[PDB]
Design a protein around this ligand. Structure first.
Ligand SMILES: N[C@@H](CCC(=O)O)C(=O)O
Ligand SMILES: N[C@@H](CCC(=O)O)C(=O)O
Ligand SMILES: N[C@@H](CCC(=O)O)C(=O)O
Ligand SMILES: [Mn+2]
Ligand SMILES: [Mn+2]
Ligand SMILES: [Mn+2]
Ligand SMILES: [Mn+2]
Ligand SMILES: [Mn+2]
Ligand SMILES: [Mn+2]
Lengths: 445, 445, 445
């Protein structure tokens, strides 16, 4: 409540308040107010900003006082407050603001009465490098990745000495220190995440050489979890930075080793009960099977939001199979063997950290409801259709399979059109710029 | 009062008093007295200095005891006192001293009875670089800008490692840390500004890559705000310096990305009421519309003072349109959608941080009054005339549209002539020195 | 004649024929045919090329067989043939092709009966440097000039030893070797020019340090002389190159020392007699005085063609005075003291080597005829109006004083409009790119 934020301000000698919001692409934006400008008026009628120079968008920042967290990194005491972008005076909420779209998808779920709450559990992976250099110019282009754990540094002269314990290319999965250099960086990330209100469940090194890592975090309701992904990413980016590292959530930074995916565990609940539990395949309800059928029916349109970068598809090369299974980890829909009670859920394996968590989760939910809503029966478990094979395909697919997103006003046409417009500009730059392996393949033609 | 300054001296064990004043170009000058020379005589009959070697000007420094601030940076305890330049013995105030000219424009407003007070709200932007090298010689010339946030450093080898989070060319507008490197430098700038008597409203990164920033600051009456711009600039220059950065207020340091403008919000008030509020276009009074009409009528003469550098016009290339609007941000006069009560005001978007805040504000006020004073009706909102396209144009225009500035003795002819003389010398050096892209364009002729 | 070219081909074992033409900007273009494609058909119906990618313009190259010269530089025996650009099939001559425009201005002179021939004598100056580096990018810009003769190298360590005889900044005018490093390079330029059909009169070092030079060459009729300037420039550029130097015709490469101008000596003749000789001021006819009056009347429009680069105006800073005189070398129209018979002529001092010699000469002639044609009496000799002070001014002036150029179809409106369009693009790049002395002037604002 406003009341509560106002005590924290004194209770913490807060010098500044950081207004934060997420844009269409997914990047957390922010503007800073002195604490002495937080008073009634503020939580009442928000603060005006020029929304015009935000990519894909005067507007009003409306502070959500439930979100107040103290920033673990800025030097002066700062209280972060997440905001919604509202349409000014009229005060309804930009239909292009991803947090508003997430909130709408949650209310539409309630209005359909299929369940009261959506529970999301994203598993975001990241890379933690020491040096990343890249560039493109008329005379050429390059990218150079470097990290102490890179299997390629086995030959490197280091002046401290080389020391040689390092994860080989698919060998980052699990060896104790010193092969895993990041135990203290991940534990620190866990402690700062909890200080910001997240609940860590586990942290470990991932499969790739050169710093792949994962901090596993307890689930939440869709829009709250989407904000927790924005804090997750902020803590990973800044703790890495304090440690002299650079972290990245891009899906596929290295060819020849693992990519970073963000698998979404989903579940639905009506009056304190898990609608996905039941009889049917592996403890699932018929309700749950239609949710899977809706996700599979709309997978390529979902890919435009859950895999929104041209790089995403370097990862999604032959979890490409649109199929559910408790057995086949090759099927993009895994039914986790919970064994346990009514933690029954589905896991969609194909999205990646580059996805805007609000739009990505809203689209998975809207697809899953359209399955239920039309008895779209999934089929049989593989123990056969595939995800979009490229961003251009995914964008065409979103453009044509636009209907399930527009249900109940969650996502307008202007919103979907402006989104495809942004992603197309990106796709073009990648399409028109010659790639280094083309010189390898075609220079002596 | 003198009395008050004299207590602060003991109350702070002040070792020195720094006498400060602004020259015609806008640069804050200063001379330092030991605290033990501040006594009755001082606040009474000022201190003599050789005014002769100040560009464009024995004279007397008259301490304004209302302005006493402790300097947050000098090692020994120092009390800053702003001064006015007075004509010696006779004690009236140099008609070429920009602070005196500002004070005269405020009294002339009172003498016309159109309002009691002018309220100015400048929005100055700046750049925060790490390295700036430049030079011109017979055999050539160069400038080299560098900053950690420069999109161009994506390819750079750094020996710490490169870390790669950086604002792209028009992408400095708003991303959270680590992409925005300056959160602590701007918050610190905010805290030192307030310690010097300013009220910060907000601080944020601006649109440009390579360190564009903005600290938004609460309005004031014209001459007081013009001094607050001189403190604003002093704090930005010295906090940046403590941080190992170099700040600059020049309008256009980089081609191909945003420039730093200083938009002036203006409003007029008679007996505690906002004369700019009313009926008419977007909450405006007819009074306000004539103010806009005077600004537009005299825009090119105002440009010689509000855009006084040849570099200013590298920014003002196709807010060039002399038009008012609540809608068109392309119109140089924006009527801000206050929505709120009688914070109704106009915003002139075209001036830049290089402007002498006293002369720039005095000229906007004198132009705006001549509009009121002659019912110079602005026209209709673009939702078509332009600003001077060059300093030479702006200087010719000031020279011919000299009358509205001379009203009530605000600005003499000698004052306007000496000003154009200074700005012409500058224009010539830029006009006669061959430019690097000319070799690109014409060497193989 | 075709017949003649065809013998030279055998007479010289010519392996290739180089088709050359000049574009709107003045740069000589070329395409190469094997000698075995020169036959009747060729001199008859020309050769087709894509005129579309020439700046400011399928078309036909029509070989002018009078122009055949052997190329003194290509390794394989090549015969250069100058061409006219004709409108295809219809075969009339592009009204935007500068050589055609020159030929039209000569025929219009004949059709007016004022004289049979125009005689032009351009005095082009050039610079001969060793190293020229420059560039402009978002993070900055630079130009670096270097030559062994640069007064600035007096301090330079050279590893051969420094040897120290060098022209000081305005001291390149006339000292014997070793101070003048270019005696053999200029004599060689003279011998190759004559081998290409030009008649050298004198060669000498010019006023500037760092390699300013001049090869003086015997006059000709307008279009023939305009082609001789294109050969002049080609020989200077390639002999310099063989010598390890780089030559440039740009008007003002160095601030603080002389610029390279191309003064045009002009004269008119009817039935073997010099119309410019007579009684009146300094041996001049009344006919000649009206020619001067037309040049002065149209000077700023002529500047858009005779001084077509933004750099041109770095040279034309306070021969700026539009005045004739036998005495005042400050007057842009000098009446040379011939003393001798009826070599009486006028000299216009203001054009520079960057000018397209066809369009520059055609415009001086058309202006001079409009003087005669309307008795535009010049005035009295200075022993007061000036040339355009910038390319933008010159381009506005050409755009408005368009009439005298359109006389008799010499220059169409499309031709004049496309020309201003090209020169404007150039002016803009120079106007929008920040200049290095602006950082010197305004960084600490
Ligand atoms: N990192 C894998 C996911 C690994 C896993 O299944 O644990 C991906 O690219 O999605
Ligand atoms: N920086 C812009 C102003 C940006 C804005 O309108 O917020 C300028 O050059 O004036
Ligand atoms: N080089 C001079 C001309 C020198 C001369 O008159 O001989 C110019 O800039 O035009
Ligand atoms: Mn994982
Ligand atoms: Mn999983
Ligand atoms: Mn701004
Ligand atoms: Mn503004
Ligand atoms: Mn000469
Ligand atoms: Mn001469």
């Amino acid at each position: 409540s406003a009341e509560h934020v106002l005590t924290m301000l004194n209770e913490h000698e807060v010098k500044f308040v950081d207004l934060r919001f997420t844009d269409t692409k997914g990047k957390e934006q922010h503007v800073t107010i002195p604490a002495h400008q937080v008073n009634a008026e503020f939580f009442e009628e928000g603060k005006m900003f020029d929304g015009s120079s935000i990519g894909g968008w005067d507007m009003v920042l409306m502070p959500d006082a439930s979100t107040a967290v103290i920033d673990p990194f800025f030097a002066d005491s700062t209280l972060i407050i997440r905001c919604d972008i509202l349409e000014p005076g009229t005060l309804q909420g930009y239909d292009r603001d991803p947090r508003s779209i997430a909130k709408r998808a949650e209310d539409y779920l309630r209005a359909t009465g299929i369940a009261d709450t959506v529970l999301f559990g994203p598993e975001p992976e990241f890379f933690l490098f020491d040096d990343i250099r890249f560039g493109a110019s008329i005379s050429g282009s390059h990218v150079a990745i470097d990290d102490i754990e890179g299997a390629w540094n086995s030959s490197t002269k280091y002046e401290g000495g080389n020391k040689g314990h390092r994860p080989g290319v698919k060998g980052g999965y699990f060896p104790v220190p010193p092969v895993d250099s990041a135990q203290d960086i991940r534990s620190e990330m866990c402690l700062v995440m909890e200080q910001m209100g997240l609940v860590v469940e586990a942290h470990h090194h991932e499969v790739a050489t050169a710093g792949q890592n994962e901090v596993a975090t307890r689930f939440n309701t869709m829009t709250k979890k989407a904000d927790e992904i924005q804090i997750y990413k902020y803590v990973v980016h800044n703790v890495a930075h304090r440690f002299g590292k650079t972290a990245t959530f891009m899906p596929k930074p290295m060819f020849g080793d693992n990519g970073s995916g963000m698998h979404c565990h989903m579940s639905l609940a009506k009056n304190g009960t898990n609608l996905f539990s039941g009889d049917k395949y592996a403890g699932l309800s018929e309700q749950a099977l239609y949710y899977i059928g809706g996700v599979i029916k709309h997978a390529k349109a979902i890919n435009a939001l859950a895999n929104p970068t041209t790089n995403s598809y370097k990862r999604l090369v032959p979890p490409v199979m649109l199929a559910y299974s408790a057995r086949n980890r090759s099927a993009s829909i895994r039914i986790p063997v919970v064994a346990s009670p009514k933690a029954r859920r589905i896991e969609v394996r194909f999205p990646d950290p580059a996805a805007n968590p609000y739009l990505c989760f809203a689209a998975l939910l809207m697809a899953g409801l359209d399955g239920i809503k039309n008895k779209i029966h999934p089929g049989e478990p593989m123990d056969i259709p595939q995800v979009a094979g490229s961003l251009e395909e995914a964008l065409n697919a979103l453009d044509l399979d636009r209907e399930f997103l527009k249900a109940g006003g969650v996502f307008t046409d202007e919103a979907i059109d402006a989104y495809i417009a942004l992603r197309r500009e990106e796709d073009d730059r990648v399409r028109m710029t010659p790639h280094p392996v083309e010189f390898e393949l075609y220079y002596s033609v």
